[PDB]
Symmetry: D2
Subunit: 268 residues, 4 copies
Amino acid sequence: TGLLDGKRILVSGIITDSSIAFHIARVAQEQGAQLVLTGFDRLRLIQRITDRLPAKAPLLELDVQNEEHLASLAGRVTEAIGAGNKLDGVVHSIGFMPQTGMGINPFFDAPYADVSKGIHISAYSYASMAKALLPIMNPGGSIVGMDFDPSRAMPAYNWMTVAKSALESVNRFVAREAGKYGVRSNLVAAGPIRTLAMSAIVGGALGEEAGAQIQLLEEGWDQRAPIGWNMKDATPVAKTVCALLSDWLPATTGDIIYADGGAHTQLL
Amino acid sequence: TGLLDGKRILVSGIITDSSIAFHIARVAQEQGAQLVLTGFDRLRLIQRITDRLPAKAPLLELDVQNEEHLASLAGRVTEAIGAGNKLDGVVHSIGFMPQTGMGINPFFDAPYADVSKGIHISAYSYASMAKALLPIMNPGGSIVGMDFDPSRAMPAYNWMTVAKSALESVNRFVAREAGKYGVRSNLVAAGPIRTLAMSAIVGGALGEEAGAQIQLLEEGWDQRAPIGWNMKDATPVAKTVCALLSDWLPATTGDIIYADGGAHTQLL
Amino acid sequence: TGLLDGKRILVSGIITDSSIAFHIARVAQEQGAQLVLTGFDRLRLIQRITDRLPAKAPLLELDVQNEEHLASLAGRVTEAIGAGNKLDGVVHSIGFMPQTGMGINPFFDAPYADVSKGIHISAYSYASMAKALLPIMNPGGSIVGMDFDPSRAMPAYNWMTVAKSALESVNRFVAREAGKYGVRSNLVAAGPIRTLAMSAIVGGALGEEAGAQIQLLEEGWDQRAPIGWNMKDATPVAKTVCALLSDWLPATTGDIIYADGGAHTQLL
Amino acid sequence: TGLLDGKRILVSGIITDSSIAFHIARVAQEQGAQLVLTGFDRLRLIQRITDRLPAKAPLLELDVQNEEHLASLAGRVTEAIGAGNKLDGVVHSIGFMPQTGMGINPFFDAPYADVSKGIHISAYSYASMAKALLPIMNPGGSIVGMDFDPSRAMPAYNWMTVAKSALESVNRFVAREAGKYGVRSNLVAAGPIRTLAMSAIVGGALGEEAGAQIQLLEEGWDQRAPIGWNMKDATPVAKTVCALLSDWLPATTGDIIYADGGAHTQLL
Ligand SMILES: NC(=O)c1ccc[n+]([C@@H]2O[C@H](COP(=O)([O-])OP(=O)(O)OC[C@H]3O[C@@H](n4cnc5c(N)ncnc54)[C@H](O)[C@@H]3O)[C@@H](O)[C@H]2O)c1
Ligand SMILES: NC(=O)c1ccc[n+]([C@@H]2O[C@H](COP(=O)([O-])OP(=O)(O)OC[C@H]3O[C@@H](n4cnc5c(N)ncnc54)[C@H](O)[C@@H]3O)[C@@H](O)[C@H]2O)c1
Ligand SMILES: NC(=O)c1ccc[n+]([C@@H]2O[C@H](COP(=O)([O-])OP(=O)(O)OC[C@H]3O[C@@H](n4cnc5c(N)ncnc54)[C@H](O)[C@@H]3O)[C@@H](O)[C@H]2O)c1
Ligand SMILES: NC(=O)c1ccc[n+]([C@@H]2O[C@H](COP(=O)([O-])OP(=O)(O)OC[C@H]3O[C@@H](n4cnc5c(N)ncnc54)[C@H](O)[C@@H]3O)[C@@H](O)[C@H]2O)c1
Ligand SMILES: O=C(Nc1cc(Cl)cc(Cl)c1)[C@H]1CC(=O)N(C2CCCCC2)C1
Ligand SMILES: O=C(Nc1cc(Cl)cc(Cl)c1)[C@H]1CC(=O)N(C2CCCCC2)C1
Ligand SMILES: O=C(Nc1cc(Cl)cc(Cl)c1)[C@H]1CC(=O)N(C2CCCCC2)C1
Ligand SMILES: O=C(Nc1cc(Cl)cc(Cl)c1)[C@H]1CC(=O)N(C2CCCCC2)C1
């Protein structure tokens, strides 16, 4: 009776128990999905974290900047879910920008090598992952990535904003490719969520001014949101990702669904 | 195990078995919802049509231009669902524009009295219905209306486009009010669906040029849509409305969900 | 050497010396335009006000809700500018919403007759004026209307927001008609300008909460604007309207130009 | 009496007599601007081409991927225009994407090193150029870049679309920096212009299917445009850039002006 009963779904992006992807994985399992997880670099950590999920899920290594990892990924997934089985869903919950590209470091002072690394991981990899996994996805399947609305500039987010603008564009092209397989591609634009790192940035890890600006952003977001916004609760975001992974948004692709309390629809 | 198990939902807008609202009502009942229906003017017809739905549903009269109908509506709904029970969902699937405001009649030749009637029924009534029903809606509830993307002009749709632009604005304000009740408000922007009337317009009911332009629109829509678009199948639209009525998009309000095959994300 | 040398331009919307249209008219005359003015209801007042413009300009009566005024307008304009001469530009600087539709009166409590009057004057009349004047406009000509960005909801602006959403849609259709004459149609979306009435609303004319919200809006607008925003200075808006009336934006139509300090491009 | 009388403007991006920047430079000189030009790699060619401009203009070498060129640029400009003089305008008319990232090569088959080079030149360099030149720009000045509307996906444009989405984001952040200097930053989103290279792509240089799709795009663009679109005429685009360089859009920044015949406002 679960929303995702019988579905096989790959979830990337878990690194702590506060990762948005941890909550996506939890809700998906509560709703009957069978998962395969991917993790970057710290696999012992990630295994220990994902031991706390409701059900067992194989963990595979994936550095999206590593061409060998991407080239072997479909085979490794198929080994984990069984020959003759394919995926019904893929969750991209991956982002990175060097400190030069976010925070109080001036916008103009980010070297391109740093910006390029952030765009590789945060935007191009959405296409890389789709390339690798579409050949082992079933018709009716769904690829979902995580977005933070970049349509307006904001303090401190700087080149990560630019990376998210690129991601939104990439998603519209991935939809064209995915459609050939009967697969949808969409982003969920979430409101601000207090992951470990965000509390770190609020405590000043990227400069005092950036932390101050994020707290103002958070406060304004809840004010503007007609149904409010709880930055400590990723579950509403996770539910939205599961909606897109389900059979219930079958005519939506190349698109952005806003799980943000409605804040982006209100000026003040 | 239905998506809408236990939910009480009001559905407006059925007039034929090809009405988008007929399919919304059908899918909602398949998913366990208990419905109350509203109909305009031809109640004997509408009862005979809705006899074909999977389950029984009380039918109430509602002309959204009639202030007495709106003032009595909540009481009549409560009588139908039982004292002490409230609604969890409301579907607005209502639209109208006089022939002077659509088709081959020149854009400049639509008298304002005609445009005003179309905007009353197609846009203002979304607010009227929310005003009437929010006092008998439960927290966590959902109001959904039907949209046809008006962000660009198009042939023949003329003042109905303007009415839909107004509706989109109205929805953002209804979200502000609905949030006070813990209720969401959203639109579903559907691709073109061949209702009775649309085949009528294709057969030339509003002029030959308008019918020709609609057929070109339909053809282009399926071409652009990365997953295709079947104008003869309202079920994907109905499923999307049910997704918004469910618990699975809990952080989305004041917003527009596109159930259009992804066509609006592609230029060609 | 003026930007608008030799051009004949109709300017509507002057009612006080703080009207945005007064400043449009002033700047247009400084730049060599020959004007015809239209005014509503208080023609003795408007004549006394426009006596202060740099140059003489005939004043014609125009109530945009009056069909007889609209039907005679082109003939009256031609009489004022001389047989055989046509207009090169038209400025629509007209808006109205009854107090029930703006301010602290609840959104749901605005009667449709009031909303309909506001939409007639604020949105439909953009089409009415184009219908009346396109037959006496020269190729290369330009129609400009005034907008306040309605893409997100905001406190108190309420049904005027809805009217501006309608206007934006109307403009895209007027562009289709105007193009047949070689004429452009565009809106200028201005930041908040302290007209007489706005100081009145700040002093509480539409309720204390509305005045408080407008002051917060004004303050936020200047903060967000990368080049700042001076609500006491309409000249930057007037210059932008003159740019659209000129020969220098010849490939822009159906569009919106933002003269708002850049505020709409920034979240905070 | 020229629109840009007395203004000192840097124009990048000339490589042939069909370059959009060649036409920007020509119109700017016709309107009284004093120019400094920058060129990439083929300076003998570019000098011979720009000999045909109405007036003399110093040519400086600038490879935007070359950090030494960027670090010396302001000094070289100041030498060319005279100590104590500053720029009033900067035109970025620079774009590049390797063949793997455009045309018929599959979207998924573009290596990131190629995409990264295209984003460096086409998007990041807008920030690089602003960083280099803002210290020698006057208050009231204007930075303009060239855009091709990337809000929807399209055939063949592929990763260049993604680069333009990034550019639009970069422009909103450059506006924040430029505002500190009293300088505006905006993009002009042009319709398709038949430069040398575009005729090359139509003749099949990036594959037959891509050429076919571009011809369909061009045809549709003129159809949709309410005032038509002439792909052989860059002058309307050049005029629009000059409007933004002028004093007549003083409250517009972080924004996009569409010089596209109005096509983006029309669905069909
Ligand atoms: N936290 C928020 O406020 C917020 C808001 C909206 C969207 N998002 C997005 O949600 C997603 C998840 O972010 P989060 O806040 O949960 O943070 P997180 O740090 O928990 O997740 C980011 C993940 O990216 C992974 N990653 C980094 N480099 C990688 C590489 N080379 N290969 C593979 N994976 C790599 C990290 O290991 C980590 O698991 C990101 O796309 C982020 O931009 C976050
Ligand atoms: N058919 C499409 O291509 C399409 C596409 C997108 C959105 N829509 C929208 O979907 C909704 C339903 O349209 P449909 O195509 O199913 O057509 P339909 O004719 O079946 O439904 C329109 C309904 O509006 C009702 N209505 C008209 N005047 C009314 C009044 N005074 N009071 C109450 N109800 C009144 C009619 O009785 C009818 O039931 C409308 O909002 C329409 O604009 C339709
Ligand atoms: N003031 C701002 O903050 C602001 C911001 C953006 C846009 N605007 C828009 O600019 C325009 C001018 O507004 P303003 O602030 O200068 O106020 P204003 O009161 O000076 O101008 C409004 C004009 O509309 C006229 N009008 C009203 N009913 C009319 C009718 N029946 N026929 C003809 N004219 C009629 C009034 O006589 C008046 O001249 C309006 O469209 C307004 O919505 C204003
Ligand atoms: N042609 C169109 O249809 C069209 C439409 C909209 C926007 N645009 C944009 O207009 C701009 C100019 O394009 P165009 O069509 O005139 O083509 P073009 O080839 O004439 O201009 C592109 C320029 O970029 C320069 N460039 C490339 N690499 C460079 C580097 N490393 N450093 C400095 N300069 C470098 C080239 O030398 C050339 O002068 C580009 O941004 C393009 O994306 C073009
Ligand atoms: O960083 C975030 N918000 C934020 C940061 C700053 Cl410096 C300013 C603002 Cl306004 C918002 C949120 C949104 C986002 O994409 N992430 C990512 C999490 C993974 C590493 C890169 C950043 C966390
Ligand atoms: O009319 C429609 N499409 C359409 C019509 C025309 Cl004339 C042109 C175009 Cl492009 C599309 C579709 C979309 C829409 O809101 N309805 C409404 C159905 C109820 C009565 C008013 C119109 C049916
Ligand atoms: O009213 C205005 N701003 C405003 C009002 C309110 Cl109540 C709230 C907010 Cl946020 C902004 C500005 C913008 C606008 O269209 N006008 C119009 C001026 C003419 C009469 C109708 C209103 C003045
Ligand atoms: O390439 C163009 N259009 C185009 C190409 C393709 Cl392959 C498809 C489509 Cl739809 C449009 C136009 C738009 C654009 O940014 N340039 C750039 C010119 C300089 C080199 C990189 C491309 C030329």
